Amino acid sequence: QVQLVQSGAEVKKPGASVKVSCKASGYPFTSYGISWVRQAPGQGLEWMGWISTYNGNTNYAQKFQGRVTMTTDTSTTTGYMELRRLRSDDTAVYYCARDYTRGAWFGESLIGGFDNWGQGTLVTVS
Template sequence: VLAQNLVIQSSSEIRKPGDSVKMSCKTSGFTFTDEYIHWIQQVPGKEIKWIGRINPWDGGTVYSSSMKERFTMTTDNSITTAHLQIDRLRGEDSATYYCARDTMSNQGYLPYKNIPKQ
């Protein structure tokens, strides 16, 4: 947990290729609508990849060009929670997923649980 900000992320998910999965990132300790929320993917043994970011204030999103086809970021501002959905899962989606608020995105990432390969 970074500084005085709390992030609670949903538990590990096991899915089959072709399925969808939706991850949650519950936050507290800062004004949710004041900062972008970033999502990051790390496949074991590889460099981290930036998936994109969402502005909770207006729902505006920016995606990495390699991620925008199957990845969808949303927020539920009423419960200060960010979501990442991946559709049409592939084996290469087996990774650790991180969410981070904008001011922390260059200082460290908070881990989402692993999505094992089937």
């Protein structure tokens, strides 16, 4: 009965930042990581990065290495992502997912995938 609940749609101006939340329930928060993937209209799935809910370690995609910051809060079992200096090309739906592709405690690769996904948060830049 795992669920991921994301914030609603946001509208931002060029140069602005957006922070998108993802509330998790139905499982031990510190046993699984959090991944973020975005999908622009008409496009496929693009990986943004990963964070461990246990030790705060991160692994970012090169494309967002200097733009995206990911954090977690284990007291409210909620993940957060902030994307800086938004451009018109960043209009997309941003999804959170439960990560079982990398361990949260050891950082090693696991045999798995992204099983639970949130509904997605639409971010528009104009």
